[PDB]
Design a protein around this ligand. Structure first.
Ligand SMILES: Oc1c(F)cccc1F
Ligand SMILES: Oc1c(F)cccc1F
Lengths: 123, 123
């Protein structure tokens, strides 16, 4: 059901593990069927598992890891800081991100907001 | 005006510096006169500079520092991870937090959401 603070920590860490391996299908199954993603926050949301899948598939050798603990609330929400390492034209680079997520009463991500801009990118 | 991504980074870092010294009056002046604070996120908002001042004064020897970079957007918002160190009955302890902030068209914090629970506290 609606995850506890403890369960939020586990779910958000699991999310980063699945990014890190690049398991698109498993990432999509963490989202509600009609979830929204704003990535980066400030840009229009994308809606639904098909669009979210399209986003991860195009976005995702990528490494990703937590760069500090998951901060969880008691209302099925949390925020986490992490870093994603990638290649963008033979050039390695990294991006520092904070995701904010709200989970639904089934334990699926209902909304995700990914905070980052160009100021968080490093070559 | 509405801060740029760069200006958000500076403003959010300045906020942590002012927490760290414990300058209640300077912290309150960063907020809009009618700002809201949800701290921890999940709890009812407090509204306005008088209530916000009351919150910082009661909350704030405290140390506070960024534990990674400020993630800023292009719509006057950002998120940052940090740690606050304190004493709570002669016992030192620490709290890991992510704040999410939205700035107004004047550069003042209009809303702040502080993500953390008991799972982020350490004795
Ligand atoms: O959640 C994510 C990722 F998993 C990868 C890049 C950005 C982002 F916001
Ligand atoms: O913004 C803050 C602080 F400045 C201190 C403790 C918690 C918090 F959310």
């Amino acid at each position: 059901n609606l995850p506890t603070a403890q369960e939020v920590q586990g779910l958000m860490a699991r999310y980063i593990e699945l990014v890190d391996v690049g398991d698109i299908e498993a990432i999509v199954q963490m989202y509600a069927d009609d979830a929204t993603v704003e990535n980066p926050f400030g840009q229009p949301p994308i809606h639904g598992r098909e669009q979210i899948a399209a986003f991860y598939r195009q976005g995702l050798k990528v490494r990703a890891c937590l760069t500090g603990p998951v901060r969880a609330s008691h209302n099925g929400c949390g925020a986490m800081p992490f870093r994603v390492e990638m290649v963008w034209n033979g050039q390695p680079c990294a991006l520092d991100v904070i995701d904010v997520m709200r989970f639904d009463e089934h334990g699926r991500i209902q909304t995700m907001q990914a905070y980052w801009s160009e100021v968080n990118l490093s070559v």
